[PDB]
Amino acid sequence: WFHPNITGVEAENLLLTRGVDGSFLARPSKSNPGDFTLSVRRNGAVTHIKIQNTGDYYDLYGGEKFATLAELVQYYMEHHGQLKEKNGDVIELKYPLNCADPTSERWFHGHLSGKEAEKLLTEKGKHGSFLVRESQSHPGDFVLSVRTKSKVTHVMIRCQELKYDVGGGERFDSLTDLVEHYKKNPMVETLGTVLQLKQPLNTTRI
Amino acid sequence: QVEYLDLDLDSADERVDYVVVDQQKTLALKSTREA
């Protein structure tokens, strides 16, 4: 549901064209850089909601606290009556409106936790087995988990201005171009381990 | 403008650790390949 680069009106535009009553999405906040916004559709109109980003937790300027943005949005999808305004009318997060994926390559697993990307590589992976996944601790960014008796080395990918860089090394126009470069020029962690991307751990059900 | 709704609210763990890439380690490793 998280749309990386859309405005409030753009979110409204989507909800009104593609979405139905009950649709929603999450996006970065334009008025308070750092925070996030939750645009919902109800009765053929849209309702934006401020998501607070303290750095230590997330919340809707009140109510329950959450460690991650996704943990927050899931909670209010499962509990439809908690999100009320002073008027009393309920806002129900029901149909998630999905944006385009970064890369269609099967080494991209979209939503995937580091614990689940670890289990994946330490059960059906090998040395140089890698994947790319959505960064849960930093919405909008991505992660290059690589298997290097098995531990994987996660590396953050910064997504800014619709561009991609790993540790500000070089600029690439897409996730693919970035994954193509470091397969040819492996990166090296602080301890000193070289991160060779030998073969991808592709997805199962495309 | 935008319509930021004025809401009425208030009615063991083990994660993974990330790393950082060393531009020096990599820029020389690459320079070693071409050589």
UniProtKB/Swiss-Prot annotation, chain A:
Changing residue 71 to K: In JMML; increases protein tyrosine phosphatase activity against CDC73. Phosphorylated upon activation of the receptor-type kinase FLT3. Phosphorylated upon activation of the receptor-type kinase PDGFRA. Phosphorylated by activated PDGFRB. The SH2 domains repress phosphatase activity. Binding of these domains to phosphotyrosine-containing proteins relieves this auto-inhibition, possibly by inducing a conformational change in the enzyme. Residues 1-97, 107-201 form the SH2 domain. This is Tyrosine-protein phosphatase non-receptor type 11. The modification Phosphotyrosine is found at residues 57, 61. Widely expressed, with highest levels in heart, brain, and skeletal muscle. It comes from Homo sapiens. It comes from the Eukaryota. Interacts with phosphorylated LIME1 and BCAR3. Interacts with SHB and INPP5D/SHIP1. Interacts with MILR1 (tyrosine-phosphorylated). Interacts with FLT1 (tyrosine-phosphorylated), FLT3 (tyrosine-phosphorylated), FLT4 (tyrosine-phosphorylated), KIT and GRB2. Interacts with PDGFRA (tyrosine phosphorylated). Interacts (via SH2 domain) with TEK/TIE2 (tyrosine phosphorylated). Interacts with PTPNS1 and CD84. Interacts with phosphorylated SIT1 and MPZL1. Interacts with FCRL4, FCRL6 and ANKHD1. Interacts with KIR2DL1; the interaction is enhanced by ARRB2. Interacts with GAB2. Changing residue 66 to L: In NS1; also found in myelodysplastic syndrome. Belongs to the protein-tyrosine phosphatase family. Non-receptor class 2 subfamily. Acts downstream of various receptor and cytoplasmic protein tyrosine kinases to participate in the signal transduction from the cell surface to the nucleus. Positively regulates MAPK signal transduction pathway. Dephosphorylates GAB1, ARHGAP35 and EGFR. Dephosphorylates ROCK2 at 'Tyr-722' resulting in stimulation of its RhoA binding activity. Dephosphorylates CDC73. Dephosphorylates SOX9 on tyrosine residues, leading to inactivate SOX9 and promote ossification. Dephosphorylates tyrosine-phosphorylated NEDD9/CAS-L. It is found in: Cytoplasm; Nucleus. The chain holds residues 6 to 221 of 593 of the full protein. Changing residue 66 to K: In acute myeloid leukemia; requires 2 nucleotide substitutions.
From Swiss-Prot, chain B:
Phosphorylated in response to FGFR1 activation. Phosphorylated on tyrosine residue(s) by the epidermal growth factor receptor (EGFR) and the insulin receptor (INSR). Tyrosine phosphorylation of GAB1 mediates interaction with several proteins that contain SH2 domains. Phosphorylated on tyrosine residues by HCK upon IL6 signaling. Transmembrane segments: none annotated. The modification Phosphotyrosine is found at residues 4, 18. Belongs to the GAB family. Identified in a complex containing FRS2, GRB2, GAB1, PIK3R1 and SOS1. Forms a tripartite complex containing GAB1, METTL13 and SPRY2. Within the complex interacts with METTL13. Interacts with GRB2 and with other SH2-containing proteins. Interacts with phosphorylated LAT2. Interacts with PTPRJ. Interacts (phosphorylated) with PTPN11. Interacts with HCK. Adapter protein that plays a role in intracellular signaling cascades triggered by activated receptor-type kinases. Plays a role in FGFR1 signaling. Probably involved in signaling by the epidermal growth factor receptor (EGFR) and the insulin receptor (INSR). Involved in the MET/HGF-signaling pathway. It is linked to Deafness, autosomal recessive, 26: A form of non-syndromic sensorineural deafness characterized by prelingual, severe to profound hearing loss. Sensorineural deafness results from damage to the neural receptors of the inner ear, the nerve pathways to the brain, or the area of the brain that receives sound information. This is GRB2-associated-binding protein 1.
